[PDB]
Amino acid sequence: GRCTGSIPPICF
Amino acid sequence: IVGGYTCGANTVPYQVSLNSGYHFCGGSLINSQWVVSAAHCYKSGIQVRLGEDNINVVEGNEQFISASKSIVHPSYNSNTLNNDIMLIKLKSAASLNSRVASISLPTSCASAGTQCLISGWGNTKSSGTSYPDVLKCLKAPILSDSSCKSAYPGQITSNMFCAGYLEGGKDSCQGDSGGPVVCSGKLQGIVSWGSGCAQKNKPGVYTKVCNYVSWIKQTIASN
Ligand SMILES: [Ca+2]
Numbered sequence: 001g002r003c004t005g006s007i008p009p010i011c012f
Numbered sequence: 013i014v015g016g017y018t019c020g021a022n023t024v025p026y027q028v029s030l031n032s033g034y035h036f037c038g039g040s041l042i043n044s045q046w047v048v049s050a051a052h053c054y055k056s057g058i059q060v061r062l063g064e065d066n067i068n069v070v071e072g073n074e075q076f077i078s079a080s081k082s083i084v085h086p087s088y089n090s091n092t093l094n095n096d097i098m099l100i101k102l103k104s105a106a107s108l109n110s111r112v113a114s115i116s117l118p119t120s121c122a123s124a125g126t127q128c129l130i131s132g133w134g135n136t137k138s139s140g141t142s143y144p145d146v147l148k149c150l151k152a153p154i155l156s157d158s159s160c161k162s163a164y165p166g167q168i169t170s171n172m173f174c175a176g177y178l179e180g181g182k183d184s185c186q187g188d189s190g191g192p193v194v195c196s197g198k199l200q201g202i203v204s205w206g207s208g209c210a211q212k213n214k215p216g217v218y219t220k221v222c223n224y225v226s227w228i229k230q231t232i233a234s235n
Binding site: 004005007012 | 034036050052053091093132134167184186187188189190203206208209
């Protein structure tokens with residue numbers, strides 16, 4: 001999905 | 013970083029790890045007291061880890077410095093990811109040397125096709141997950157804004173650009189957020205978002221740092 005590569009990811 | 017290579021210790025001396033009892037984002041050192049990262053990486057309790065290679069072993073070039081200030085852009089939108097930039101002030105100045113060094117800010121925006129270096133300690137797999145000990149690197153080109161928009165219809169603002177590949181296999185991924193995209197010795201991008209990692213037809217999307225240079229300078233000057 002549309003997500004950031006953070007830990008944890010932030011997805012939309 | 014998927015599809016990349018081992019950078020080599022301290023070969024990316026502006027790369028930082030943001031740590032809250034675990035590595036959660038990257039960032040870029042821009043002077044002895046300030047780091048640039050992504051707004052989406054904001055949290056309380058950030059420790060900045062400079063001079064890292066193996067993030068799991070104390071090797072000798074590390075400097076661990078608490079954030080004193082973490083300043084998200086006032087216009088950051090967490091739904092669109094527009095203005096995905098944050099400035100972190102270090103509680104004390106880093107000691108700068110060959111292995112811990114700042115990266116220059118752009119004096120102009122970069123062009124499509126320009127090769128850049130993207131780095132981080134994020135996931136190295138496109139299917140599933142594996143987190144590396146040492147810093148990984150990827151050379152990647154800036155894509156045309158039209159290709160970026162074709163990939164992500166309705167989602168690319170003037171404060172974003174795409175870099176990487178359309179064929180799959182090479183990208184920034186989970187744990188790389190906030191980290192650098194350096195092109196010709198200038199910090200042009202911040203790891204921001206994408207549709208998955210290293211998927212066909214879905215390049216990485218990065219915050220367009222050249223739009224923020226005056227804002228960065230004013231923010232630092234006032235803090
Ligand atoms: Ca280390």
